[PDB]
Amino acid sequence: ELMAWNQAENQRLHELRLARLRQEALEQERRQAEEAVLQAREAQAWAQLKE
Amino acid sequence: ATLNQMHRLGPPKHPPGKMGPTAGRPQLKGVVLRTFIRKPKKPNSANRKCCRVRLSTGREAVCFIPGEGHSLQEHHVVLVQGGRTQDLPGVKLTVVRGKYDCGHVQKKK
Amino acid sequence: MARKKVRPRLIAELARRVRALREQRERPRDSQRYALDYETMMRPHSGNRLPMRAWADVRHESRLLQLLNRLPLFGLGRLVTRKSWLWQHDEPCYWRLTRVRPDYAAENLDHGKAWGILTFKGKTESEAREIEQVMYHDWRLVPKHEEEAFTAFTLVPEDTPLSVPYPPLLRAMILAQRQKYGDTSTEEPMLNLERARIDPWDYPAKLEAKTKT
Amino acid sequence: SIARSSVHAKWVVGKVIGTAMQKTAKVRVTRLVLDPYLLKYFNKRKTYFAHDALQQCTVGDIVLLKALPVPRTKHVKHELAEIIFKVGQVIDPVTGKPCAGTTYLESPISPE
Amino acid sequence: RAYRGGHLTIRLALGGCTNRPFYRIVAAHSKCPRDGRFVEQLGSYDPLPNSHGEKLVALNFDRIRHWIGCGAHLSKPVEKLLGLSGFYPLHPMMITNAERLRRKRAREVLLASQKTD
Amino acid sequence: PMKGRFPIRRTLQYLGQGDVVFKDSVKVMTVNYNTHGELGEGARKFVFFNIPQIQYKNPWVQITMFKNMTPSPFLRFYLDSGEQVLVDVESKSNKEIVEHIRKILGKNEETLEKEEQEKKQLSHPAHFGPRKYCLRECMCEVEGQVPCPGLVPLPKEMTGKYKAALKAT
RNA sequence: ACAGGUUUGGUCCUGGCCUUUCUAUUAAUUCUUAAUAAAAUUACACAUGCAAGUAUCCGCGCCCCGGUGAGAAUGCCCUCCAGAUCUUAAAGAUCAAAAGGAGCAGGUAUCAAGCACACCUAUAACGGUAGCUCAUAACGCCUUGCUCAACCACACCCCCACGGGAAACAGCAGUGAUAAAAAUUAAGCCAUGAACGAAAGUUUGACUAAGUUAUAUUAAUUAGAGUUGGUAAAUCUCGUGCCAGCCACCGCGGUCAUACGAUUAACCCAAAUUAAUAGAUCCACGGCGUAAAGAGUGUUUAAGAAAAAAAAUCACAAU
RNA sequence: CCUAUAUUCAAUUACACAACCAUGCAAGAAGAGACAAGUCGUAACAAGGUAAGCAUACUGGAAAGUGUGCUUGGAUUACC
Ligand SMILES: [Mg+2]
Ligand SMILES: [Mg+2]
Ligand SMILES: [Mg+2]
Ligand SMILES: [Mg+2]
Ligand SMILES: [Mg+2]
Ligand SMILES: [Mg+2]
Ligand SMILES: [Mg+2]
Ligand SMILES: [Mg+2]
Ligand SMILES: [Mg+2]
Ligand SMILES: [Mg+2]
Ligand SMILES: [Mg+2]
Ligand SMILES: [Mg+2]
Ligand SMILES: [Mg+2]
Ligand SMILES: [Mg+2]
Ligand SMILES: [Mg+2]
Ligand SMILES: [Mg+2]
Ligand SMILES: [Mg+2]
Ligand SMILES: [Mg+2]
Ligand SMILES: [Mg+2]
Ligand SMILES: [Mg+2]
Ligand SMILES: [Mg+2]
Ligand SMILES: [Mg+2]
Ligand SMILES: [Mg+2]
Ligand SMILES: [Mg+2]
Numbered sequence A: 001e002l003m004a005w006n007q008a009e010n011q012r013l014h015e016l017r018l019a020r021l022r023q024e025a026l027e028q029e030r031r032q033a034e035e036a037v038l039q040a041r042e043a044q045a046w047a048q049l050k051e
Numbered sequence B: 001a002t003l004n005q006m007h008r009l010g011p012p013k014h015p016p017g018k019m020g021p022t023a024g025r026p027q028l029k030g031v032v033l034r035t036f037i038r039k040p041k042k043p044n045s046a047n048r049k050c051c052r053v054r055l056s057t058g059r060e061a062v063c064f065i066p067g068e069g070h071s072l073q074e075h076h077v078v079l080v081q082g083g084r085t086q087d088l089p090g091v092k093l094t095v096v097r098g099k100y101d102c103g104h105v106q107k108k109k
Numbered sequence C: 001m002a003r004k005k006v007r008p009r010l011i012a013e014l015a016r017r018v019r020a021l022r023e024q025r026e027r028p029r030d031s032q033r034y035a036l037d038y039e040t041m042m043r044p045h046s047g048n049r050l051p052m053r054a055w056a057d058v059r060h061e062s063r064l065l066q067l068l069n070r071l072p073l074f075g076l077g078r079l080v081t082r083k084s085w086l087w088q089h090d091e092p093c094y095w096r097l098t099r100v101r102p103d104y105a106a107e108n109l110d111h112g113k114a115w116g117i118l119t120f121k122g123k124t125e126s127e128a129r130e131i132e133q134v135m136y137h138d139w140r141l142v143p144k145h146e147e148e149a150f151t152a153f154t155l156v157p158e159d160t161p162l163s164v165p166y167p168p169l170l171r172a173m174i175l176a177q178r179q180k181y182g183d184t185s186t187e188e189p190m191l192n193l194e195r196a197r198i199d200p201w202d203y204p205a206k207l208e209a210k211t212k213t
Numbered sequence D: 001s002i003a004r005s006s007v008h009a010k011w012v013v014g015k016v017i018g019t020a021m022q023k024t025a026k027v028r029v030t031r032l033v034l035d036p037y038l039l040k041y042f043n044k045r046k047t048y049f050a051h052d053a054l055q056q057c058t059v060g061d062i063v064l065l066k067a068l069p070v071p072r073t074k075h076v077k078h079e080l081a082e083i084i085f086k087v088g089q090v091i092d093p094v095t096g097k098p099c100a101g102t103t104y105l106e107s108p109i110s111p112e
Numbered sequence E: 001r002a003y004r005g006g007h008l009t010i011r012l013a014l015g016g017c018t019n020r021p022f023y024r025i026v027a028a029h030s031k032c033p034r035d036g037r038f039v040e041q042l043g044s045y046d047p048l049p050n051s052h053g054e055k056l057v058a059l060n061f062d063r064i065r066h067w068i069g070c071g072a073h074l075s076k077p078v079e080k081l082l083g084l085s086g087f088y089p090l091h092p093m094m095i096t097n098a099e100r101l102r103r104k105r106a107r108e109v110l111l112a113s114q115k116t117d
Numbered sequence F: 001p002m003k004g005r006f007p008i009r010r011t012l013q014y015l016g017q018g019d020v021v022f023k024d025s026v027k028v029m030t031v032n033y034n035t036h037g038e039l040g041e042g043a044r045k046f047v048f049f050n051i052p053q054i055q056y057k058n059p060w061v062q063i064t065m066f067k068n069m070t071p072s073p074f075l076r077f078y079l080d081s082g083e084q085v086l087v088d089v090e091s092k093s094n095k096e097i098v099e100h101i102r103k104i105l106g107k108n109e110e111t112l113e114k115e116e117q118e119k120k121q122l123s124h125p126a127h128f129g130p131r132k133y134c135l136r137e138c139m140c141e142v143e144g145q146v147p148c149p150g151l152v153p154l155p156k157e158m159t160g161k162y163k164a165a166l167k168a169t
Numbered sequence G: 001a002c003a004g005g006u007u008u009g010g011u012c013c014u015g016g017c018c019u020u021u022c023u024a025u026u027a028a029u030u031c032u033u034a035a036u037a038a039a040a041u042u043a044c045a046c047a048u049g050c051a052a053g054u055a056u057c058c059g060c061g062c063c064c065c066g067g068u069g070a071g072a073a074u075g076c077c078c079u080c081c082a083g084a085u086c087u088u089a090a091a092g093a094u095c096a097a098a099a100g101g102a103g104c105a106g107g108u109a110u111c112a113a114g115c116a117c118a119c120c121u122a123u124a125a126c127g128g129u130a131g132c133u134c135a136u137a138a139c140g141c142c143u144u145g146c147u148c149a150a151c152c153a154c155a156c157c158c159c160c161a162c163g164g165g166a167a168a169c170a171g172c173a174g175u176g177a178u179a180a181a182a183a184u185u186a187a188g189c190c191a192u193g194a195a196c197g198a199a200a201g202u203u204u205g206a207c208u209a210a211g212u213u214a215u216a217u218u219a220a221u222u223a224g225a226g227u228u229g230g231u232a233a234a235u236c237u238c239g240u241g242c243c244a245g246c247c248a249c250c251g252c253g254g255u256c257a258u259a260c261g262a263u264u265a266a267c268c269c270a271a272a273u274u275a276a277u278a279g280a281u282c283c284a285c286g287g288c289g290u291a292a293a294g295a296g297u298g299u300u301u302a303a304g305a306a307a308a309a310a311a312a313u314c315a316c317a318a319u
Numbered sequence H: 001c002c003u004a005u006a007u008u009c010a011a012u013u014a015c016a017c018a019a020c021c022a023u024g025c026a027a028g029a030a031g032a033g034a035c036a037a038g039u040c041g042u043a044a045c046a047a048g049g050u051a052a053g054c055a056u057a058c059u060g061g062a063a064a065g066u067g068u069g070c071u072u073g074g075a076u077u078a079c080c
């Protein structure tokens, strides 16, 4: 009874986690857009200087 | 120290008592080799009455004779006890008065 | 027990083997063993002195192999009784000899190991067994004609009550105890003596080692 | 049904110290012992020899030991049951996914 | 300690003080000393009559018969005591000594009436 | 005790008062936790506070910690059957972990009370002997009985010397 | 520890030593009677007596009890039980060898390496890998009974006991020797226990009851010991003159000594009182600029901490 | 070996061995401590009359002296 109960519990928590992680993935892609922008800018500045 | 170090060394343990002149025994029986006189240390002066004795353990030691006056010759057997005489450097033993060949001090007559 | 530095004692084993060997090799013939001085009533071998109550029966009676040595087949199928049984038990007490293995170191051939089937107080055992207290002098042989006179047995039933009262306190305990659980039966609690049957001390014990089941 | 070991150790978990011997893993099991003066818990370590049938054990793996009913030798009282954590390669028992340290190697939220 | 042989036995261990005896009824190995180690204490026996004129015996009957139920032999005074309780039949020697005592009383009665004359 | 961050937890009392008693199935508990992240927090606190309590009442159970192996905190219990309980502890508080574990494999207060009840019937009030095991030694010390003669010297008649000196003459 | 004395011309700090409490032996001085308890120098040598027999012969018993602490870091706690014994058909139950290990377990690291101390294969051998223990103390050396309803170990010596030295009280009494160390060459099996006996019962220096001894309690019949500079309760007059002597620590004695010796008085314990020796107790969860103490420097291993928020990087005389 | 049992044996051989320890005694050697109201100086303490000292080297009846780096647990009294 209790082992099955614990099983159920761990599965519930697993779902909660999966939700949280998808969220984090979204926020992370947003970060990636930001970083992409900055690195593009500085790549341009450097290309200019060297040219 | 830290907790780790205190665990590593264990709790402090009281060192066993180093044993003295009479070797853990309350008294010792011994025979008188010689009787002589010893000057005390510097702050205060007399000449104390001492003897040399050989003890049941075979160790020969200087020993002190309490009370005023005494009769002791070579070969006399005596009983000695632990009390250390403060004036006399190096003399850790004391003749028991009133046993074997050393009698109680005789009241003046 | 086990401490990592433990020493290998060899001489323990040596003393064991050597003592077992000197035991088997020097193992005494029962001829010299049960040999007896009849004047002092003293065994030479063991230095043992015999019980006072056993004195008369030593002088006036003969051991089994003293009466079995002058028998033709060395007494096979014969019937033998014991003086103490004759005196104490009026019902027939006898040994039917199956095998007899005498000891030949004996000059007079008075000693040996015996086997057989027993009838005590008329009751007969169904098996072969080694005979006990052979060296004793109680032993007597019954003649061929009086044989059927001794084996004649009047079968009588046993009158000892099968059940007895419980001791007073134990009884009261049982009563109160079944009273507690709602048992109203006032029927007297009874002690069943059926398996409490014990042989009298005269009954010979078996010398054969027990098989563990 | 009698199969037993007289050893208190029936189930343990320990690190793999060394693989040097044939079909045998040396394993350091570590327990919490209470230092009585300080009333505090420290790690006592003890080594066990475990039977590895397939020689499956790298050095550094976290491993479960089951007590052997009959001792293989004086020093081998245990058998290697499971490899709980393979060294440098670990599949998270919770989410069933490969991970290097606290990072996921394959995301549990990207099934396809 | 390990012995060669011997049996489980219920006996009297003598606890006590000079001229004031007391007995702990005890489940013991046979070969170990009297007052010494024991398997279990069963009961206690106070030989001296108290304020009310009583010798107190306490017996743990459950455990007593557990141990007799395990094949424990009783000592003669243990027997005498259990029989006095009525947990056991009266030991034959209790009764026999009772008779011997009665005959002693009879011969002392007659000797008294013979000396009075 | 002075040294340490939360010195109270090195006290005999604190260790005694933690209540979890594992079933007899439980042999090994493995804690796997992290030293960083907000989520793993409770787990850490657990390792810091209750792990000592737990281990104190379960002296024969092996407890082992592993740090920064898995990205997520959890417990594993190894039973005598070969059964493996996996307990995820994530955003769970310290207390929640304790109560949840006590729930899964605990011992009901019934169980524990029956056990201690069996241990308390071990010492029997009526026995006699050493002060260590017994309430009384002589029966000299029970009220109505005859006193220890080393307290109250006996009447001359109860003395064996008097009885022997009488039988002699 | 409820603390106290003592470093200095003096203060504060640090820091030893000692005092005050309790127990045991011995010794000195004193000692009236009971009861109880306990009885202890010695694993050196032992005169004499006794300590195991029972039982109609077989047998069953005969270091079991009792003795002792020599040895061994021996071991405690805990697994698992062959065997022996008892009872019974079996099953049970008591004692539990060997084998084991979660944990605990004397000192010493100026004992740091041990030197074969592992595993596999399989058939039980051939053979094959090259391991195993250890700074979380291996391997040594020294000291030692114990964690006590008890346990462990020894049984003249050579760990053992075939053999060999050699002729055995470490059973009760005793005796030499030895030591500061001093119980009766005693009475009973009446009671418990043990052995043997079917049983009446017999045996038992186990034990019961006695003998001895201020060793300790208690009760009353019993008064003596120590002390009186400070710590620390309590002193007067003589004698002595750095002499004779005294003291646990400080110290006292050089002609006006409450400190020596004696007297008077007092104090305090009391059938005991002091001394000596061992214990019990007592060090650091405290410290490390100047007092004992941050190891001349950096790196990694083992082992730990990560406990909440971030960082790596630019004039100048590194090498 | 028509019931059944009886009897025998189990000791050597190959080497190494007081090294190695511990415990006494010792011709002798060296040190420390205690020690004159002794002899010779004056090193240190005050810029101790050449500031002390550390490491190291060499030297000297004796404290000690001198070299080379280092320390302040020395001063330079501070609009000089
Ligand atoms: Mg002076
Ligand atoms: Mg003195
Ligand atoms: Mg005298
Ligand atoms: Mg006999
Ligand atoms: Mg007594
Ligand atoms: Mg002080
Ligand atoms: Mg000073
Ligand atoms: Mg001064
Ligand atoms: Mg005396
Ligand atoms: Mg004495
Ligand atoms: Mg003993
Ligand atoms: Mg040794
Ligand atoms: Mg068994
Ligand atoms: Mg065992
Ligand atoms: Mg010893
Ligand atoms: Mg020996
Ligand atoms: Mg001897
Ligand atoms: Mg021997
Ligand atoms: Mg003797
Ligand atoms: Mg003997
Ligand atoms: Mg003598
Ligand atoms: Mg005398
Ligand atoms: Mg008797
Ligand atoms: Mg009797």
Ligand SMILES: [Mg+2]
Pocket: none
């Ligand atoms: Mg006698």
Ligand SMILES: [Mg+2]
Pocket: G214, G272
């Ligand atoms: Mg006294």
Ligand SMILES: [Mg+2]
Pocket: G246
């Ligand atoms: Mg004086």
Ligand SMILES: [Mg+2]
Pocket: G257
């Ligand atoms: Mg004067």
Ligand SMILES: [Mg+2]
Pocket: G259
């Ligand atoms: Mg004074």
Ligand SMILES: [Mg+2]
Pocket: none
């Ligand atoms: Mg005076």
Ligand SMILES: [Mg+2]
Pocket: none
């Ligand atoms: Mg300090």
Ligand SMILES: [Mg+2]
Pocket: none
């Ligand atoms: Mg310093």
Ligand SMILES: [Mg+2]
Pocket: none
């Ligand atoms: Mg530095």
Ligand SMILES: [Mg+2]
Pocket: none
């Ligand atoms: Mg240095």
Ligand SMILES: [Mg+2]
Pocket: none
């Ligand atoms: Mg100079």
Ligand SMILES: [Mg+2]
Pocket: H047, H049
């Ligand atoms: Mg100047």
Ligand SMILES: [Mg+2]
Pocket: H042, H043, H048
């Ligand atoms: Mg100068």
Ligand SMILES: [Mg+2]
Pocket: none
């Ligand atoms: Mg100068």
Ligand SMILES: [Mg+2]
Pocket: none
């Ligand atoms: Mg000059």
Ligand SMILES: [Mg+2]
Pocket: H051, H052
């Ligand atoms: Mg200067």
